[PDB]
Amino acid sequence: IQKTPQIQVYSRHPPENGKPNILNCYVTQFHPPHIEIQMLKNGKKIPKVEMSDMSFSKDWSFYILAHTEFTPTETDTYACRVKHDSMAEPKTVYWDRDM
């Protein structure tokens, strides 16, 4: 029995083009614990991505937070790519500043 991750992509502070910020990728509701998470700028893996320690919630399912420094701009895209056994392929989720 396997659980598909839920994924939220969002910045720590409200985004302003040109202003340094933190991008979060928050992955919940998954089993088993093993997971691979990449954060992407313009489809390119971001090098220094800090990974929180893994936890699990009361319903037994695991959660983790990836984060990285980023400066939002008008044209650059940002995404979180999540590889997990409950999925045939890695799920990519784009950062949307309105969400």
Binding site: I1, Q6, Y10, H31, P32, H34, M54, F56, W60
Partner: protein
């Protein structure tokens, strides 16, 4: 209300005889200590500053306990392979939640002890701390074994004694951090949705603790059904974020108002879309 919890996980590794063991403690839902067997020196570590108040004996005694827990989960994990006729190779998970709740009368409201195998309920100590609830056939084997051995008396004694004692201590020690709030910073955004229709999104940011209520209103009435509510998410700095949106007729936005409820708010916020 107040609570202490220890959440433990052991994961079976393909090609290795020792499981990955991770244990995390929480006081009032905030991580305060942590053990990970993968670390370079496997020991319990403070995860909240008010835990630096503990001397080296504490961490030594806690670390020793974890090495005992490592072996217990290792053997139990091996036993579960038998119960389910599970193949060699493979990765398997065993989890444990334990701890206590204190009431408003700071008295022990309840003790907890639960186990899950493969992310699913396995066995649990019932609220009386005497009986066991087994979720399936293999857990009946463990239930019966543990009735026959007086397992529950040991757990009961921990939950009503040691757990309660240290929770009081941590609540005293970490009082100024634990009992603090950070009230939400709130604003409303406006976005395109579809032909003659817009989204109004009400944000609440930088708040602590995690518990919060956002509601939208038109003409004096709630919009429980009709509103999208995200799952509360960590900002990364100890604070949390949430938002709630509604789809609205274009030209009728001012008719809509958002209310935010939080422990750091004496009176709830009233927000509106401001063009």
């Amino acid at each position: 209300p107040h609570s202490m919890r220890y959440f433990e996980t052991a994961v079976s590794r393909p090609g290795l005889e020792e499981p990955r063991y991770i244990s995390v403690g929480y006081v009032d839902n905030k991580e305060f200590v942590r053990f990970d067997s993968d670390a370079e020196n496997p020991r319990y570590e403070p995860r909240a500053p008010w835990m630096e108040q503990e001397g080296p004996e504490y961490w030594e005694r806690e670390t020793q306990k974890a090495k005992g827990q490592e072996q217990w989960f290792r053997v139990s994990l091996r036993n579960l392979l038998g119960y389910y006729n599970q193949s060699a190779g493979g990765s398997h998970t065993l989890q444990q939640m334990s701890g206590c709740d204190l009431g408003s009368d700071w008295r022990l409201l309840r003790g907890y002890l639960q186990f899950a195998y493969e992310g699913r309920d396995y066995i649990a100590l019932n609220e009386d701390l005497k009986t066991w609830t087994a979720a399936d056939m293999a857990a009946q084997i463990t239930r019966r074994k543990w009735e026959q051995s007086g397992a529950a008396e040991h757990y009961k004694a921990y939950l009503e004694g040691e757990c309660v004692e240290w929770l009081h201590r941590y609540l005293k020690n970490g009082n100024a951090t634990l009992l603090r709030t950070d009230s939400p910073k709130a604003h409303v955004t406006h976005h395109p949705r579809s032909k003659g229709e817009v989204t109004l999104r009400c944000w609440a940011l930088g708040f602590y603790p995690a518990d919060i209520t956002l509601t939208w209103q038109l003409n004096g009435e709630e919009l429980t059904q009709d509103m999208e509510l995200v799952e509360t998410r960590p900002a990364g700095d100890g604070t949390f974020q949430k938002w709630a949106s509604v789809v609205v007729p274009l030209g009728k936005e001012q008719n809509y108002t958002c209310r935010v409820y939080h422990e750091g708010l004496p009176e709830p916020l009233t927000l509106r879309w401001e063009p």
